[model samples]
Target: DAGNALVERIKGAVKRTRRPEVMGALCELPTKYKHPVLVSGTDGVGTKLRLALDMKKHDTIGIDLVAMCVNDLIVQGAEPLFFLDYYATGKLDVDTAAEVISGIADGCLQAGCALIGGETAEMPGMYEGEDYDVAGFCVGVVEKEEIIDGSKVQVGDALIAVGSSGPHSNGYSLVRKILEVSKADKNERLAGKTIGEHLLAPTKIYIKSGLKLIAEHDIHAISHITGGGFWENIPRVLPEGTKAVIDGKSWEWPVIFQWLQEKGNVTTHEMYRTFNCGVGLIIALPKDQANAAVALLQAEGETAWVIGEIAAANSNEAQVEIN
Candidate 1:
């Protein structure tokens, strides 16, 4: 059962950044530096959680929570430190909640970080019975000198993509709506795994691979493509006047995406924006750094692909032309 029972240990505790809550964060030991930097982010499972819950997939909720924050942290040149969580429900059921927590703990282990703390709130009066919502808090650290911010970006820097496990947590609301309208879940026409299993493949966490590359060589910048797709996120780490010219034909498209496109009539452009389309985290580094980085990343068990290159930001906005 891929339910919430898997997620209980993801966060030791969660606290208000502004409020003095008991399990606030892992910052009590912020004594490490004169100019210590804390990289933190918060995000929920979004409407996708509704579908997961309806399908009894609480297992991925913890994963979605951690991914929503920590994946983005390492892109900003920060190493994930610890995580805190917030789980709220009409009533906390031990079985479901625990599954979700297992995923959270799994996320912590993948990131080489700790699941320091969190909170579980049962507000029967507010939430509808069986309804639940989750949020994740993450803290990351980086020394000033080591922070990679696309500052070294130049024309000819190779853009590499590490593949995503599945959708990696976005655009499920649309996917769910399409599934419901089509009744794909109940149709005998579908074979093997059910529609539920296809959508519930927990997101891929690249913290370990990304950090390992960071340690061995110079990464100008990186982007974790989520809500805005590669369209927007790729530029987040771009140097001024620089653009990412993606050679889309470079990598093979993920099969699930092809399924989504053919099944739901989703367009290629929309697919790029809403899903990783197989490529998850994008990396930018000097061409000279490309071979070594790719080798080291693959050695870490990741399928790193040479995705694209950098160019001067053209007049018509940072464009990605897919062939």
Candidate 2:
């Protein structure tokens, strides 16, 4: 829809590329600032892209691209300023690429950032025919004094979970394995949608809501659940001497997660560690403000479920275990 007009304007327009936001292609950021505060993250969509290719669903892959990078940086109190994407394939499929870019723009809009620029490289024989690898880079800024490292994390800090929509693009290797072993073809009924449909669910970009609490509430620490389970991801942000005691029963795991566990024979610990287990991000807030913060998230249509609480400052490292 976007590039249709351009086709008529040009004499020989074969593939119409999406009119991705072009902001004065000349105006660029300065390389060096006297006191620059830069926080950046780089990540790829991993094997999740294979699923999208199988399903021929390019749109949601953009969501995976967004979450892979932005969610990583949001944990440290950094606000994403701008984003750039790298899409490389043997041959560029304009329609598929357009859907992908639209998804990226949607993710950026949802996270309160701008999709300033991107590069779509078409290299023949580089990938198998039309296979493409997508990567995202995010630039964020944080003051030296305002950076959050969880040093103040103490006992009794609440573990507040921001519910995830679906498998946020991690553990695709195991997912593929599960499908292969179970004779689970995309054709069979799954979640009222095709099996391919559910498996192709996009990654959730949690920066918007995650940063909301960081800005409006007094959160001692926050963790963005990614490749690592809650077991590993939570400890990354905790202070040296603090830990988080998460009560798994506090929040219900989505039916999809339960289905994966039941079918895959995954353990409680492995399930929580591998996937977000339904909670995409966890905010450690003071107990007194927990309800208000949750209410705030709820008002915005987010499920801010209180999973558990932080232990004392002298407690062990962050740990998550199901009851």
Candidate 3:
């Protein structure tokens, strides 16, 4: 009962306040900018999208979609300017499409990005029933001289970890596995909310706090802890011959993460590599700015603290060490 029917108003459904117009088959955009280094990132919500489908909750998944994409851009000291999304399903259901777009609009608002354009595909045989998937792309800009890379990461720099809302859209495949293996009840209450609710919590966007910190401090590097978790992601922004020495007791793990550990009997090393545990974004900055940075993040209503420090690496030692 569908084919291009929902595609008729796809243009207006993606409209945003103060965004450029999408005209005809191809849209023209501004091509000139002063001292702008374009940084782009693309990511999907992964298996977590399956959970949203199971729950018949399409709203917040779009937030998860945007978070997974734009968070990667912000870590490079870029200010997100715009976003696009790809939504595909077998049958084009206007109501479901509208619900999903609402979250994408909401997420774009949170990250201060314009939802200028996107694609909605109605593939009759590609997807089954109401099953659909979405992916997001984000483009941002940064002044060439202001880009934060590991080149400035000094040995004495401190690691400041920011709080995550939940797993923040990573480790969902494992999360679902734990639920199935343990036969956990999704409707049951955990941490004052149903397990399903906790699993579906929209990822917290750090664009506001992260961009502000970049403007305020001479930060060394910014790392977004995503699919790789801490063990792999942190090293991506650290300099060669350096290691991030983390204090295992730096902060308490979130309740949802705690439950996952007990349910699957997951090991500590695997947990850090698979799940966020608690920390989402980590900033490497001068030791002097560490405390002030933490205070600044706290003032912004984000839970943050010194979680580790940079140390000289010796003879092929691991870039990250959780002690």
Tell me, by lDDT, which candidate is best: 3
Which stretch of 10 consecutive residues in model 1 shows the poorest summed lDDT? 13-22
Q: Write the per-residue lDDT of candidate 2 for residues 1-323, one digit (tens) a residue.
A: 32443223321211121122224422233333334467898888888888888678887888788777888788777767677788888876777776777777677666655666677787788899668888888776665666777776777777788887777888787777777788666776666876677677777777766667777888777777878766678765555555667775687777777777877887876787777778778887789989988988887778777888766554543354444
Ranking by lDDT: 3, 1, 2
Give the range where candidate 2 is weakest over 10 consecutive residues by summed lDDT.
Answer: 10-19
TM-score of 1: 0.86
> After TM-score superposition, what is the CA distance of residue 286 in candidate 2 from its true location, in Å?
1.4
TM-score of 3: 0.91
TM-score (C-alpha, index-matched) for candidate 2: 0.84
- Ten contiguous residues minimizing lDDT sum, candidate 3: 21-30
lDDT score, residue 112, model 3?
A: 75
TM of each candidate vs. truth: 0.86, 0.84, 0.91
lDDT of 3: 0.82
Against the unseen true structure, what C-alpha lDDT does each candidate score?
0.74, 0.71, 0.82
Better of 1 and 2 by TM-score: 1
lDDT of 2 at 321: 41
